[PDB]
Short mmCIF file of N, CA, C and O in Angstrom, two decimals:
data_model
loop_
_atom_site.label_atom_id
_atom_site.label_comp_id
_atom_site.label_asym_id
_atom_site.label_seq_id
_atom_site.Cartn_x
_atom_site.Cartn_y
_atom_site.Cartn_z
N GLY A 13 12.60 -24.19 23.32
CA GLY A 13 12.38 -22.85 22.79
C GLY A 13 13.43 -21.86 23.27
O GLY A 13 14.39 -21.58 22.56
N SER A 14 13.23 -21.33 24.47
CA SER A 14 14.16 -20.37 25.04
C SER A 14 14.70 -20.85 26.38
O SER A 14 13.94 -21.04 27.33
N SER A 15 16.01 -21.05 26.45
CA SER A 15 16.65 -21.52 27.68
C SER A 15 17.54 -20.43 28.28
O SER A 15 18.68 -20.25 27.85
N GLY A 16 17.01 -19.71 29.26
CA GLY A 16 17.77 -18.65 29.90
C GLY A 16 17.20 -17.28 29.61
O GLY A 16 16.98 -16.48 30.53
N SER A 17 16.96 -16.99 28.33
CA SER A 17 16.42 -15.70 27.93
C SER A 17 17.04 -14.57 28.74
O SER A 17 16.35 -13.64 29.16
N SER A 18 18.35 -14.66 28.96
CA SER A 18 19.06 -13.65 29.73
C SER A 18 20.46 -13.42 29.16
O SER A 18 21.21 -14.37 28.94
N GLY A 19 20.80 -12.16 28.92
CA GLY A 19 22.11 -11.83 28.38
C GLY A 19 22.06 -11.54 26.89
O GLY A 19 21.25 -12.12 26.17
N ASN A 20 22.93 -10.64 26.44
CA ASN A 20 22.99 -10.28 25.03
C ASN A 20 23.10 -11.52 24.15
O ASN A 20 23.88 -12.43 24.44
N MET A 21 22.31 -11.55 23.08
CA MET A 21 22.33 -12.68 22.15
C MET A 21 22.84 -12.26 20.78
O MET A 21 22.46 -11.20 20.27
N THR A 22 23.70 -13.08 20.19
CA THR A 22 24.26 -12.79 18.88
C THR A 22 23.28 -13.14 17.77
O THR A 22 22.17 -13.60 18.03
N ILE A 23 23.69 -12.91 16.53
CA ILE A 23 22.85 -13.20 15.38
C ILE A 23 22.81 -14.70 15.09
O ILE A 23 21.79 -15.23 14.64
N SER A 24 23.92 -15.37 15.34
CA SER A 24 24.02 -16.81 15.10
C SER A 24 22.94 -17.56 15.87
O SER A 24 22.50 -18.63 15.46
N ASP A 25 22.52 -16.99 17.00
CA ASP A 25 21.49 -17.60 17.83
C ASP A 25 20.14 -17.58 17.12
O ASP A 25 19.26 -18.38 17.43
N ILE A 26 19.99 -16.66 16.18
CA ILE A 26 18.74 -16.54 15.43
C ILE A 26 18.71 -17.51 14.25
O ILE A 26 17.71 -18.19 14.03
N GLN A 27 19.80 -17.56 13.50
CA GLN A 27 19.90 -18.45 12.35
C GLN A 27 19.91 -19.91 12.79
O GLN A 27 19.40 -20.78 12.08
N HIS A 28 20.48 -20.17 13.96
CA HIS A 28 20.55 -21.53 14.49
C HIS A 28 19.17 -22.02 14.90
O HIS A 28 18.94 -23.23 15.00
N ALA A 29 18.26 -21.09 15.15
CA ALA A 29 16.90 -21.43 15.56
C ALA A 29 16.35 -22.57 14.71
O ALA A 29 16.61 -22.66 13.51
N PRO A 30 15.58 -23.46 15.35
CA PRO A 30 14.97 -24.61 14.67
C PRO A 30 13.87 -24.20 13.70
O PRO A 30 13.35 -25.03 12.95
N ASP A 31 13.51 -22.92 13.73
CA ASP A 31 12.47 -22.40 12.85
C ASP A 31 12.94 -21.13 12.15
O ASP A 31 12.18 -20.16 12.05
N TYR A 32 14.18 -21.13 11.68
CA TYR A 32 14.74 -19.97 11.00
C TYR A 32 14.72 -20.17 9.49
O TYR A 32 15.41 -19.46 8.75
N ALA A 33 13.93 -21.13 9.03
CA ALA A 33 13.82 -21.42 7.61
C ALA A 33 12.48 -20.95 7.05
O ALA A 33 12.35 -20.67 5.86
N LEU A 34 11.48 -20.86 7.93
CA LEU A 34 10.15 -20.42 7.53
C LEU A 34 10.04 -18.90 7.57
O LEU A 34 8.95 -18.35 7.72
N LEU A 35 11.18 -18.23 7.42
CA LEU A 35 11.21 -16.77 7.44
C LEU A 35 11.49 -16.22 6.04
O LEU A 35 12.59 -16.39 5.51
N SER A 36 10.50 -15.55 5.46
CA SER A 36 10.64 -14.97 4.13
C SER A 36 11.92 -14.14 4.03
O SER A 36 12.32 -13.49 5.00
N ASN A 37 12.54 -14.16 2.86
CA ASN A 37 13.77 -13.40 2.64
C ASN A 37 13.74 -12.08 3.40
O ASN A 37 14.75 -11.66 3.98
N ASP A 38 12.58 -11.43 3.41
CA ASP A 38 12.42 -10.16 4.10
C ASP A 38 12.41 -10.36 5.61
O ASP A 38 13.04 -9.61 6.35
N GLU A 39 11.67 -11.37 6.06
CA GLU A 39 11.57 -11.67 7.48
C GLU A 39 12.96 -11.87 8.10
O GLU A 39 13.31 -11.23 9.09
N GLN A 40 13.74 -12.76 7.50
CA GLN A 40 15.08 -13.05 7.99
C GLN A 40 15.83 -11.76 8.30
O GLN A 40 16.35 -11.58 9.40
N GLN A 41 15.88 -10.85 7.32
CA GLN A 41 16.57 -9.58 7.50
C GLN A 41 16.21 -8.94 8.84
O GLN A 41 17.07 -8.73 9.69
N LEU A 42 14.93 -8.64 9.02
CA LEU A 42 14.45 -8.03 10.25
C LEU A 42 14.98 -8.78 11.47
O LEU A 42 15.73 -8.22 12.28
N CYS A 43 14.60 -10.04 11.59
CA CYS A 43 15.04 -10.87 12.71
C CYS A 43 16.49 -10.56 13.08
O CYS A 43 16.84 -10.51 14.26
N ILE A 44 17.32 -10.36 12.07
CA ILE A 44 18.73 -10.05 12.28
C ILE A 44 18.91 -8.64 12.83
O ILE A 44 19.72 -8.41 13.72
N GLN A 45 18.15 -7.70 12.28
CA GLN A 45 18.23 -6.31 12.71
C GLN A 45 17.75 -6.16 14.15
O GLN A 45 18.49 -5.68 15.01
N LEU A 46 16.52 -6.58 14.41
CA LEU A 46 15.95 -6.49 15.75
C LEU A 46 16.48 -7.61 16.64
O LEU A 46 16.09 -7.73 17.81
N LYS A 47 17.38 -8.42 16.10
CA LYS A 47 17.97 -9.53 16.84
C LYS A 47 16.90 -10.32 17.58
O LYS A 47 16.99 -10.53 18.79
N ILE A 48 15.88 -10.75 16.85
CA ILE A 48 14.79 -11.52 17.43
C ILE A 48 14.71 -12.92 16.83
O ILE A 48 14.92 -13.10 15.63
N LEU A 49 14.42 -13.91 17.67
CA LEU A 49 14.32 -15.29 17.22
C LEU A 49 13.01 -15.53 16.48
O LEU A 49 12.01 -14.84 16.70
N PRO A 50 13.00 -16.54 15.59
CA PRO A 50 11.81 -16.89 14.81
C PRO A 50 10.72 -17.51 15.67
O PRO A 50 9.53 -17.37 15.38
N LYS A 51 11.13 -18.21 16.73
CA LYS A 51 10.18 -18.85 17.63
C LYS A 51 9.23 -17.83 18.24
O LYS A 51 8.01 -17.90 18.08
N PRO A 52 9.80 -16.86 18.97
CA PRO A 52 9.02 -15.80 19.62
C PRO A 52 8.41 -14.83 18.62
O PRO A 52 7.26 -14.41 18.77
N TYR A 53 9.17 -14.48 17.59
CA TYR A 53 8.71 -13.56 16.57
C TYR A 53 7.41 -14.06 15.93
O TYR A 53 6.54 -13.27 15.56
N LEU A 54 7.29 -15.38 15.81
CA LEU A 54 6.11 -15.99 15.22
C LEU A 54 4.88 -15.76 16.10
O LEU A 54 3.81 -15.39 15.62
N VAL A 55 5.05 -15.98 17.41
CA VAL A 55 3.96 -15.79 18.35
C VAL A 55 3.32 -14.42 18.20
O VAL A 55 2.12 -14.30 17.96
N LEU A 56 4.13 -13.38 18.33
CA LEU A 56 3.65 -12.01 18.20
C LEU A 56 3.06 -11.76 16.82
O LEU A 56 2.08 -11.03 16.66
N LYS A 57 3.67 -12.38 15.81
CA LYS A 57 3.21 -12.23 14.43
C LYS A 57 1.77 -12.71 14.29
O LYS A 57 0.93 -12.03 13.69
N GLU A 58 1.48 -13.88 14.85
CA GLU A 58 0.14 -14.45 14.78
C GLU A 58 -0.87 -13.54 15.48
O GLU A 58 -2.02 -13.41 15.03
N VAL A 59 -0.45 -12.92 16.57
CA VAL A 59 -1.31 -12.02 17.32
C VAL A 59 -1.72 -10.82 16.48
O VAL A 59 -2.90 -10.47 16.41
N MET A 60 -0.75 -10.18 15.85
CA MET A 60 -1.01 -9.01 15.01
C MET A 60 -2.12 -9.30 14.01
O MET A 60 -2.88 -8.41 13.63
N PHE A 61 -2.22 -10.56 13.59
CA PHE A 61 -3.24 -10.97 12.63
C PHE A 61 -4.57 -11.22 13.33
O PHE A 61 -5.60 -10.68 12.93
N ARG A 62 -4.54 -12.04 14.37
CA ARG A 62 -5.74 -12.37 15.13
C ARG A 62 -6.48 -11.10 15.55
O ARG A 62 -7.69 -11.12 15.76
N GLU A 63 -5.74 -10.01 15.67
CA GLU A 63 -6.32 -8.73 16.07
C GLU A 63 -6.71 -7.91 14.85
O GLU A 63 -7.72 -7.19 14.87
N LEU A 64 -5.92 -8.01 13.79
CA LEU A 64 -6.18 -7.27 12.56
C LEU A 64 -7.47 -7.76 11.90
O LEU A 64 -8.09 -7.03 11.12
N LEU A 65 -7.88 -8.98 12.23
CA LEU A 65 -9.10 -9.56 11.68
C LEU A 65 -10.31 -9.20 12.54
O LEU A 65 -11.40 -8.95 12.02
N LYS A 66 -10.11 -9.19 13.85
CA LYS A 66 -11.18 -8.87 14.78
C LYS A 66 -11.73 -7.46 14.52
O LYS A 66 -12.94 -7.25 14.52
N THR A 67 -10.82 -6.52 14.29
CA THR A 67 -11.21 -5.14 14.02
C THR A 67 -11.41 -4.90 12.53
O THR A 67 -12.16 -4.01 12.12
N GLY A 68 -10.74 -5.71 11.71
CA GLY A 68 -10.85 -5.57 10.27
C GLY A 68 -9.71 -4.78 9.67
O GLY A 68 -9.51 -4.79 8.46
N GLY A 69 -8.96 -4.09 10.52
CA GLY A 69 -7.84 -3.30 10.05
C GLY A 69 -7.76 -1.94 10.72
O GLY A 69 -7.80 -0.91 10.05
N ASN A 70 -7.66 -1.94 12.04
CA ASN A 70 -7.58 -0.70 12.81
C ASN A 70 -6.45 -0.75 13.82
O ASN A 70 -6.63 -0.42 15.00
N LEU A 71 -5.27 -1.17 13.37
CA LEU A 71 -4.10 -1.27 14.24
C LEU A 71 -3.11 -0.15 13.94
O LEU A 71 -2.75 0.09 12.79
N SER A 72 -2.66 0.53 14.99
CA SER A 72 -1.71 1.63 14.84
C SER A 72 -0.65 1.58 15.94
O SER A 72 -0.90 1.06 17.03
N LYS A 73 0.52 2.12 15.65
CA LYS A 73 1.62 2.15 16.61
C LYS A 73 1.09 2.31 18.03
O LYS A 73 1.44 1.53 18.93
N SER A 74 0.25 3.31 18.24
CA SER A 74 -0.33 3.57 19.55
C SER A 74 -0.74 2.27 20.23
O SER A 74 -0.39 2.02 21.38
N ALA A 75 -1.50 1.45 19.51
CA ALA A 75 -1.96 0.17 20.04
C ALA A 75 -0.89 -0.90 19.91
O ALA A 75 -0.56 -1.59 20.87
N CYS A 76 -0.35 -1.04 18.70
CA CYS A 76 0.69 -2.03 18.44
C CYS A 76 1.68 -2.11 19.60
O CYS A 76 1.91 -3.18 20.15
N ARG A 77 2.25 -0.96 19.95
CA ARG A 77 3.22 -0.90 21.04
C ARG A 77 2.70 -1.66 22.27
O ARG A 77 3.47 -2.29 22.99
N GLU A 78 1.40 -1.58 22.50
CA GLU A 78 0.78 -2.25 23.63
C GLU A 78 0.51 -3.72 23.31
O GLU A 78 0.91 -4.61 24.06
N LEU A 79 -0.17 -3.97 22.20
CA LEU A 79 -0.49 -5.33 21.78
C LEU A 79 0.71 -6.25 21.95
O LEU A 79 0.62 -7.29 22.60
N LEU A 80 1.84 -5.86 21.36
CA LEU A 80 3.06 -6.65 21.45
C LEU A 80 3.84 -6.30 22.72
O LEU A 80 3.98 -5.14 23.08
N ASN A 81 4.35 -7.33 23.39
CA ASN A 81 5.12 -7.14 24.61
C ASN A 81 6.60 -6.97 24.30
O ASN A 81 7.41 -7.87 24.54
N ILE A 82 6.96 -5.80 23.77
CA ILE A 82 8.35 -5.51 23.43
C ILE A 82 8.63 -4.01 23.52
O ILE A 82 7.76 -3.23 23.89
N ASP A 83 9.85 -3.62 23.17
CA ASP A 83 10.25 -2.22 23.20
C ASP A 83 9.47 -1.41 22.17
O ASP A 83 8.95 -1.94 21.19
N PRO A 84 9.37 -0.09 22.40
CA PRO A 84 8.66 0.82 21.51
C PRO A 84 9.37 1.01 20.18
O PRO A 84 8.75 1.00 19.12
N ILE A 85 10.69 1.17 20.24
CA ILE A 85 11.49 1.36 19.03
C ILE A 85 11.54 0.08 18.20
O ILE A 85 11.48 0.13 16.97
N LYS A 86 11.64 -1.06 18.88
CA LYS A 86 11.69 -2.35 18.20
C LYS A 86 10.38 -2.62 17.46
O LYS A 86 10.39 -3.12 16.33
N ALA A 87 9.26 -2.29 18.10
CA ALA A 87 7.95 -2.50 17.50
C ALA A 87 7.84 -1.78 16.16
O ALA A 87 7.48 -2.38 15.15
N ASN A 88 8.14 -0.48 16.17
CA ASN A 88 8.07 0.32 14.96
C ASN A 88 8.51 -0.48 13.74
O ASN A 88 7.79 -0.57 12.75
N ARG A 89 9.70 -1.07 13.82
CA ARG A 89 10.24 -1.86 12.73
C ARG A 89 9.26 -2.96 12.32
O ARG A 89 8.94 -3.12 11.15
N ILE A 90 8.80 -3.72 13.31
CA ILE A 90 7.85 -4.81 13.06
C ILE A 90 6.59 -4.29 12.39
O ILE A 90 6.10 -4.88 11.42
N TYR A 91 6.06 -3.19 12.91
CA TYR A 91 4.84 -2.59 12.36
C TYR A 91 4.99 -2.35 10.86
O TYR A 91 4.18 -2.82 10.06
N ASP A 92 6.03 -1.61 10.48
CA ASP A 92 6.28 -1.31 9.08
C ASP A 92 6.35 -2.59 8.25
O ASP A 92 5.67 -2.71 7.22
N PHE A 93 7.16 -3.54 8.70
CA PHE A 93 7.32 -4.81 7.99
C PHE A 93 5.97 -5.30 7.46
O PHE A 93 5.86 -5.70 6.30
N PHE A 94 4.96 -5.27 8.31
CA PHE A 94 3.62 -5.71 7.93
C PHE A 94 3.12 -4.94 6.71
O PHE A 94 2.51 -5.51 5.81
N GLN A 95 3.38 -3.64 6.70
CA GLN A 95 2.95 -2.78 5.60
C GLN A 95 3.71 -3.12 4.32
O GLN A 95 3.18 -3.01 3.22
N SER A 96 4.97 -3.54 4.48
CA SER A 96 5.80 -3.89 3.34
C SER A 96 5.28 -5.14 2.64
O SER A 96 5.52 -5.35 1.45
N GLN A 97 4.56 -5.97 3.39
CA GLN A 97 4.00 -7.20 2.85
C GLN A 97 2.55 -7.00 2.43
O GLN A 97 1.76 -7.95 2.40
N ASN A 98 2.19 -5.76 2.11
CA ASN A 98 0.83 -5.44 1.70
C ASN A 98 -0.19 -6.22 2.52
O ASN A 98 -1.27 -6.56 2.03
N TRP A 99 0.16 -6.52 3.77
CA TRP A 99 -0.72 -7.26 4.65
C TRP A 99 -1.78 -6.34 5.27
O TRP A 99 -2.90 -6.77 5.55
N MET A 100 -1.41 -5.09 5.48
CA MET A 100 -2.32 -4.11 6.06
C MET A 100 -2.70 -3.05 5.04
O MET A 100 -3.44 -2.11 5.35
#
């Protein structure tokens, strides 16, 4: 999965990922913008759902920022993405 997880990572590191094919045309874009791998991105993605179902649909930046273990600015992008997929 992740060997080192230290030091600036290029975009090629994302496309090279062993799971960079199961990313919807839209997903791929983001991954490149937020420079996030599909492996880890998937984990957090599943969480956003497991929680969106428990509450039924009461997730907001305020919480999202906490739910996901990442930067505040980076999250924003992810949050919206979900809305773009009429998922929320």
